[PDB]
Design an enzyme around this catalytic site. Structure first.
Site, PDB file in Angstrom:
ATOM      1  N   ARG A   1      -7.464  -8.676   9.528  1.00 19.97           N
ATOM      2  CA  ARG A   1      -7.237  -7.230   9.429  1.00 19.97           C
ATOM      3  C   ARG A   1      -7.494  -6.704   8.001  1.00 19.97           C
ATOM      4  O   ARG A   1      -6.920  -5.695   7.581  1.00 19.97           O
ATOM      5  CB  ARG A   1      -5.824  -6.898   9.925  1.00 19.97           C
ATOM      6  CG  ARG A   1      -5.660  -7.169  11.429  1.00 19.97           C
ATOM      7  CD  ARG A   1      -4.266  -7.635  11.830  1.00 19.97           C
ATOM      8  NE  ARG A   1      -3.389  -6.526  12.210  1.00 19.97           N
ATOM      9  CZ  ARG A   1      -2.307  -6.638  12.983  1.00 19.97           C
ATOM     10  NH1 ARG A   1      -1.938  -7.816  13.485  1.00 19.97           N
ATOM     11  NH2 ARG A   1      -1.585  -5.556  13.262  1.00 19.97           N
TER      12      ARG A   1
ATOM     13  N   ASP B   1      -7.085  -4.530  -6.377  1.00 13.94           N
ATOM     14  CA  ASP B   1      -6.446  -5.835  -6.135  1.00 13.94           C
ATOM     15  C   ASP B   1      -7.309  -6.778  -5.282  1.00 13.94           C
ATOM     16  O   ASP B   1      -7.016  -7.968  -5.184  1.00 13.94           O
ATOM     17  CB  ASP B   1      -5.032  -5.670  -5.533  1.00 13.94           C
ATOM     18  CG  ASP B   1      -5.040  -5.274  -4.058  1.00 13.94           C
ATOM     19  OD1 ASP B   1      -4.004  -5.480  -3.389  1.00 13.94           O
ATOM     20  OD2 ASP B   1      -6.062  -4.758  -3.560  1.00 13.94           O
TER      21      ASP B   1
ATOM     22  N   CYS C   1      -1.679  -7.885  -0.486  1.00 18.45           N
ATOM     23  CA  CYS C   1      -1.670  -6.694   0.373  1.00 18.45           C
ATOM     24  C   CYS C   1      -0.438  -6.623   1.278  1.00 18.45           C
ATOM     25  O   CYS C   1       0.094  -5.541   1.523  1.00 18.45           O
ATOM     26  CB  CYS C   1      -2.918  -6.656   1.257  1.00 18.45           C
ATOM     27  SG  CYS C   1      -4.472  -6.866   0.379  1.00 18.45           S
TER      28      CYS C   1
ATOM     29  N   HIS D   1      -9.902  -1.382  -2.929  1.00 26.84           N
ATOM     30  CA  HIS D   1      -8.736  -1.550  -3.800  1.00 26.84           C
ATOM     31  C   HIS D   1      -9.037  -2.500  -4.954  1.00 26.84           C
ATOM     32  O   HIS D   1      -9.669  -3.536  -4.753  1.00 26.84           O
ATOM     33  CB  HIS D   1      -7.567  -2.099  -2.989  1.00 26.84           C
ATOM     34  CG  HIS D   1      -7.073  -1.170  -1.923  1.00 26.84           C
ATOM     35  ND1 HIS D   1      -5.978  -1.461  -1.139  1.00 26.84           N
ATOM     36  CD2 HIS D   1      -7.509   0.050  -1.525  1.00 26.84           C
ATOM     37  CE1 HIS D   1      -5.771  -0.469  -0.291  1.00 26.84           C
ATOM     38  NE2 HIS D   1      -6.683   0.462  -0.508  1.00 26.84           N
TER      39      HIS D   1
ATOM     40  N   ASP E   1       0.775  -1.236   0.000  1.00 28.29           N
ATOM     41  CA  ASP E   1       0.000   0.000   0.000  1.00 28.29           C
ATOM     42  C   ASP E   1       0.812   1.295   0.000  1.00 28.29           C
ATOM     43  O   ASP E   1       0.361   2.300  -0.551  1.00 28.29           O
ATOM     44  CB  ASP E   1      -0.973  -0.025   1.179  1.00 28.29           C
ATOM     45  CG  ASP E   1      -2.054  -1.086   1.019  1.00 28.29           C
ATOM     46  OD1 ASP E   1      -2.325  -1.518  -0.127  1.00 28.29           O
ATOM     47  OD2 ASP E   1      -2.635  -1.486   2.041  1.00 28.29           O
ATOM     48  N   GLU E   2       1.996   1.276   0.604  1.00 25.82           N
ATOM     49  CA  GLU E   2       2.803   2.486   0.751  1.00 25.82           C
ATOM     50  C   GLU E   2       3.555   2.863  -0.528  1.00 25.82           C
ATOM     51  O   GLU E   2       3.899   4.029  -0.715  1.00 25.82           O
ATOM     52  CB  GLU E   2       3.798   2.328   1.908  1.00 25.82           C
ATOM     53  CG  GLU E   2       4.464   3.632   2.379  1.00 25.82           C
ATOM     54  CD  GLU E   2       3.488   4.627   3.000  1.00 25.82           C
ATOM     55  OE1 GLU E   2       3.681   5.845   2.810  1.00 25.82           O
ATOM     56  OE2 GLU E   2       2.533   4.202   3.679  1.00 25.82           O
TER      57      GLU E   2
HETATM   58  C1  LIG Z   1      -5.665  -5.649  -0.209  1.00 25.15           C
HETATM   59  C2  LIG Z   1      -5.085  -4.480   0.534  1.00 25.15           C
HETATM   60  N1  LIG Z   1      -4.218  -3.697  -0.092  1.00 25.15           N
HETATM   61  N2  LIG Z   1      -5.457  -4.300   1.799  1.00 25.15           N
HETATM   62  C3  LIG Z   1      -5.063  -3.261   2.735  1.00 25.15           C
HETATM   63  C4  LIG Z   1      -6.285  -3.055   3.622  1.00 25.15           C
HETATM   64  C5  LIG Z   1      -6.060  -3.434   5.085  1.00 25.15           C
HETATM   65  C6  LIG Z   1      -5.680  -2.264   5.999  1.00 25.15           C
HETATM   66  N3  LIG Z   1      -6.040  -2.729   7.339  1.00 25.15           N
HETATM   67  C7  LIG Z   1      -5.919  -2.015   8.463  1.00 25.15           C
HETATM   68  O1  LIG Z   1      -5.489  -0.872   8.478  1.00 25.15           O
HETATM   69  C8  LIG Z   1      -6.348  -2.663   9.752  1.00 25.15           C
HETATM   70  C9  LIG Z   1      -7.655  -3.136   9.846  1.00 25.15           C
HETATM   71  C10 LIG Z   1      -8.111  -3.744  11.013  1.00 25.15           C
HETATM   72  C11 LIG Z   1      -7.254  -3.883  12.100  1.00 25.15           C
HETATM   73  C12 LIG Z   1      -5.946  -3.413  12.011  1.00 25.15           C
HETATM   74  C13 LIG Z   1      -5.489  -2.805  10.841  1.00 25.15           C
HETATM   75  C14 LIG Z   1      -4.070  -2.315  10.798  1.00 25.15           C
HETATM   76  O2  LIG Z   1      -3.705  -1.464  11.639  1.00 25.15           O
HETATM   77  O3  LIG Z   1      -3.287  -2.766   9.933  1.00 25.15           O
HETATM   78  C15 LIG Z   1      -6.381  -0.995   5.583  1.00 25.15           C
HETATM   79  N4  LIG Z   1      -7.681  -0.895   5.834  1.00 25.15           N
HETATM   80  O4  LIG Z   1      -5.753  -0.111   5.027  1.00 25.15           O
HETATM   81 CA   LIG Z   2       4.422   7.803   1.790  1.00 26.23          CA
END
Ligand SMILES: *CC(=N)NCCC[C@H](NC(=O)c1ccccc1C(=O)O)C(N)=O
Ligand SMILES: [Ca+2]
Ligand SMILES: *CC(=N)NCCC[C@H](NC(=O)c1ccccc1C(=O)O)C(N)=O
Ligand SMILES: [Ca+2]
Ligand SMILES: [Ca+2]
Ligand SMILES: [Ca+2]
Ligand SMILES: [Ca+2]
Ligand SMILES: [Ca+2]
Ligand SMILES: [Ca+2]
Ligand SMILES: [Ca+2]
Ligand SMILES: [Ca+2]
Ligand SMILES: [Ca+2]
Lengths: 628, 628
Positions: B604, B438, B610, B436, B315-316
């Protein structure tokens, strides 16, 4: 395109918008060979057939539905030893067409240039039809006057559906967040539905036959960060499910192009002349007034009370136009120079059917090259195959950028380029003290050739003229004869002055550079060009000024010319410079009127063109029929 | 083009640059018929001739001069009863060529696309060859390392003149004030000559034969307000006159195009894999490490100390590249989401031969759709004639903008569009909770067809799978078998759940919309597309989440696939979802490895794609050979 998945287990319900491609997936949910299709007369099914994924089954309705699911499709799945099993599909046909003037007569998915192209035109609503007000009409989110609608583009949503269709469906009109700051849309069926604040709006539309008219205005001209296209989209939404989100069934769009700001060259017939009343300049205004009367033009004079002693009517503004199939209006480009005439374009040039636009920083960071004496246009030309039917914008620059060099502000340059339709050409004017292209060139009408002549100031021609007079015995003839408050100069002393000749050789080199530049970029030959005798002198920072009133800097009102009176050597009862200009221009059927501007304009580094401005007829050629 | 005005009164001196058009005006200053031309062997005069203005007299030198005025031209003006009178012209020929890699092999006046086009390529110097530092190499105005020059474009000024030629002439190199903030030029003959501060610079060049090498770097990628072209110009200045200003004799230019940032689809061979080490996720990293070893890829793991507990390596950042004939390097596009991985792209992804770029607001004003799981690219495709040999960027959006809808920031959208070469396509992803592309699509290599398959998540396929198992008598089979910390669900109860079926019908409609959108914009047929069985569920704001681990969200390392382990109903000793995916993908020669990511990533709201990222080989097809 839409792919409906039919099933023998459960019946399928679907909407079909007319003019769209509808296909069936029969195999995926088929039971276990073979299948046959039977449909109601309203459904035309194109494709006793095998159950093979590659078999394309496409459906098209001819007319809109009277009631929900009034058209039927029956797919019969059978086999060698299997009684047929039926899958049912209930169809509802509707018309949803978003219409606009895409043929550009005033009544693909892209906007294309040219006479065989498609795409609607949008005018920037930059005039002020609202009686007694300050702002442009497009600055608020209301239609204040009925006349204001004439500037806007009509867009109509036509729908033909069942009477109850919008119980479970909703139409939404929208524009991307990218483009919402540049357009405003009013619902007539006036109240705003889309604009800078709102990118989308639910439409309230009754079932059956309905027509919903919209009126659209642009809020911005094409520019660096705006190619000039605005897309408006209608979306049909399925809202049958009270717990599920709305689902998109169909989208259709209209693409608008925002009309560019367009200038008018001297070869376009004049309609209105502008000037200032200032210090003792009454006789100057008499000559211009008579010239305006002869050319049958409206005359507008800015008085001293509004002038703040700013006499340079050429420099604060440029009068162009914007053009659509439904509406054409003049539009004033207000220069950021913001001198004494600062308010003139705003107060009573802008108005009913007279648009306004400005660019660049308004409180400072400006140069003399931002004055619109440095902004001109050629007549229509064709350069090695490529047509420029609206001509080519010309503006002055340096030959390269240095610490001491000047330029027109990039914001102005970028705007002019972004209009696209008069592909700007950079000329070299920075060698002049004032630095304006109108100081060394002009265009005049002509009955032959390309319909014009390029006039260029020419030291060569003047030296030639003066040498011919000396050869014929007029060496004592006095430059500045008739001017009591100045020392006269003999033709022999002018010719023998080596430093004056040096100065004029350098100026000749500067003009010659532009001559060849214009010949390349406008496709000119020598037969298109006439040299006007003109001497120059270098002063502060070695910058060029006119030695005698700069004759090329003239007011061109059709065949009537307002030329600065040079006060040249009088031979055989007449100024030899006047006779030379007359001999060059009278064969073209031009009428030369020499106006005394010496102690009024000339001594303050400008002439008749600098002290005036003209509104001219827009081109008959429609800009969208060009292929830039 | 240049027109030299000759005169019988005074001799003329002039410079002629080889490869330029030089002509003579013989008539204007002629005395009073007829004339003849005689020139030295070095001068070729094309055109016993009458004194008529229309007679074109053109001169061309073949070689540069050894000394000033070493070539002669003599125009003899004569008549019926007049002895000839001579006008003299002393010519000095010089070579002045500004050279660059315009043929794009690594060694018109415009930049043209395609294999038969012309124009040099410029790389943005956005990597960091300088050992032990923070900033990009292009942020200062010095060449700190010799290796840094490999990223720059070579430009050479070749001159051949008389030994004393630059006593009275000077060469100046310049770039418009418009473009100076986007380029920097160093003189090698390293010290800066042109850049953000300086738009022009006098060149110190000796007479005779000389070669002056320059190295050029770009400071900005193509964007909304930068089409991506940079023009550098050399001007020859006549400085013979100590009191007059410098006069321009000759200008020549080279036009550079700045190389776009380019993404790499899953069908490009992988070179390096990225991931995070976090909470108990050691077994996840083992599976990825083994997969990376099988695909012979370099492996980079961001540790918990740098992560700040941010596991979403997808993602970053997005790893693309920039490409020129002389140099190709990977370039990281850093997303503005700025979560725990904020520093990873800056600290040790950016580096020697690894570029950096970022866009959008860095302190806030961002959405989940700015995470680069929402940024992908198709493989190369041809859509109804038009080739996209580098594929087409795909990113997710809503179907229309509303108060509750999300979008990728316009600054990111505009940047991607301005790269031009992978013409972005907006997909519909906003129906997902995370949002997303993906989450519902992927691409994998294939040995037939177009060299790939589009994988799409498919509720239809999963219901079909589960119904087939129930028909064969496995209704009791348990979803989530193997997961001790969760309640299992029987296939019969999943199938009988009407609300789950409703939810999945809506999700199917959302994916089907994208299916047809992709078919139109990528030119796909059904034979290019494989459905992957996948159930979904709607949660907060009716937004979709994966019911079981989202299998389409997979790591594609050539023929080695890292798929999320679905933990589906075990029939005949194996998960029926795994067997179904294997049956779809193994015929393409793909190897399916199912990775347990349930309590680490899935809970999550993300999966294997991801939690990872990949650097892939740049396309062999050179972007400039495209015609966008
Ligand atoms: C497929 C993909 N690129 N997914 C990224 C989406 C997942 C994250 N998840 C979180 O931020 C999250 C969700 C629930 C509990 C903890 C966390 C976390 O801190 O990582 C998003 N939504 O960006
Ligand atoms: Ca950045
Ligand atoms: C051809 C053209 N557009 N000329 C405009 C250039 C003249 C003005 N002049 C002045 O500002 C000026 C010069 C001397 C004395 C008084 C004044 C004045 O206040 O008008 C310009 N340089 O812009
Ligand atoms: Ca209004
Ligand atoms: Ca109006
Ligand atoms: Ca102004
Ligand atoms: Ca109006
Ligand atoms: Ca003007
Ligand atoms: Ca550097
Ligand atoms: Ca570097
Ligand atoms: Ca490097
Ligand atoms: Ca990505």
């Amino acid at each position: 395109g839409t792919l409906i998945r039919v099933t023998p287990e459960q019946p399928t319900h679907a909407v079909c918008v007319l003019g769209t491609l509808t296909q069936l997936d029969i195999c995926s949910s088929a039971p276990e060979t073979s299948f046959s299709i039977n449909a109601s007369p309203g459904v035309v099914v194109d494709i006793t057939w095998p159950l093979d994924p590659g078999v394309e089954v496409t459906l098209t309705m001819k007319a809109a539905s009277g009631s929900t699911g009034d058209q039927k499709v029956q797919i019969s799945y059978y086999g060698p030893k299997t009684p047929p099993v039926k899958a049912l599909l209930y169809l509802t046909a509707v018309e949803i067409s978003l219409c606009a003037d895409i043929t550009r007569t005033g009544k693909q998915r892209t906007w294309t240039w040219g006479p065989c192209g498609q795409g609607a035109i949008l005018l920037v609503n930059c005039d002020r039809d609202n009686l007694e007000s300050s702002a442009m009409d497009c600055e608020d989110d209301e239609v204040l006057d009925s006349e204001d609608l004439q500037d806007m583009s009509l867009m109509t949503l036509s729908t033909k559906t069942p009477k109850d269709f919008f119980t479970n469906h909703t139409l939404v009109l929208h524009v991307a967040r990218s483009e919402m700051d540049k357009v405003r849309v009013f619902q007539a069926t006036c109240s705003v539905v889309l604009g800078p604040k709102w990118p989308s709006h639910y439409l309230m539309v009754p079932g059956g036959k309905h027509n919903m008219d919209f009126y659209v205005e642009a809020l911005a001209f094409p520019d660096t960060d705006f190619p000039g296209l605005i897309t408006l989209t209608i979306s049909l939404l399925d809202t049958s499910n009270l717990e599920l989100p709305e689902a998109v069934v169909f989208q259709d769009s209209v693409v608008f192009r925002v009309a560019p700001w367009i200038m008018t060259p001297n070869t376009q017939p004049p309609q209105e002349v502008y000037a200032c009343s200032i210090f003792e300049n009454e006789d100057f205004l008499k000559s211009v007034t008579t010239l305006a009367m002869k050319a049958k033009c409206k005359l507008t004079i800015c008085p001293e009370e509004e002038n703040m002693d700013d006499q340079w009517m050429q420099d604060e503004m440029e009068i162009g136009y914007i053009q659509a199939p439904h509406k054409t209006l003049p539009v004033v480009f207000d220069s950021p120079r913001n001198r004494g005439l600062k308010e003139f374009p705003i107060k009573r040039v802008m108005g009913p059917d007279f648009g306004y636009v400005t660019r660049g920083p308004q409180t400072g960071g400006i140069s003399g090259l931002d004055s619109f004496g440095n902004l001109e246009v050629s007549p229509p030309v064709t350069v090695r195959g490529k047509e420029y039917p609206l001509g080519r914008i010309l503006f002055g620059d340096s030959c390269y950028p240095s610490n001491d060099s000047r330029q027109m502000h990039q914001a102005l340059q970028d705007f002019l380029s972004a209009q696209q339709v008069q592909a700007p050409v950079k000329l070299y004017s920075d060698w002049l003290s004032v630095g304006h292209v109108d100081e060394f060139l002009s265009f005049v009408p002509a009955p032959d050739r390309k319909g014009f002549r390029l006039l260029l100031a020419s030291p060569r021609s003047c030296y030639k003229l003066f040498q011919e007079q000396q050869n014929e015995g007029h060496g004592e003839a006095l430059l500045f004869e008739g001017i009591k408050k100045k020392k006269q100069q003999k033709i022999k002393n002018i010719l023998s002055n080596k430093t004056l000749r040096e100065h004029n050789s350098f100026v000749e080199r500067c003009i010659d550079w532009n001559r060849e530049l214009l010949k390349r970029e406008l496709g000119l030959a020598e037969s298109d060009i006439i040299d006007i005798p003109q001497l120059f002198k270098l002063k502060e920072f070695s910058k060029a000024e006119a030695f005698f009133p700069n004759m090329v800097n003239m007011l061109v009102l059709g065949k009537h010319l307002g030329i600065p009176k040079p006060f040249g050597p009088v031979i055989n009862g007449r100024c030899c410079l006047e006779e030379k200009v007359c001999s060059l221009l009278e064969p073209l059927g031009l009428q030369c009127t020499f106006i005394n501007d010496f102690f009024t304009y000339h001594i303050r580094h400008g002439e008749v063109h600098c002290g005036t401005n003209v509104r001219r007829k827009p081109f008959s050629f429609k800009w969208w029929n060009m292929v830039p």
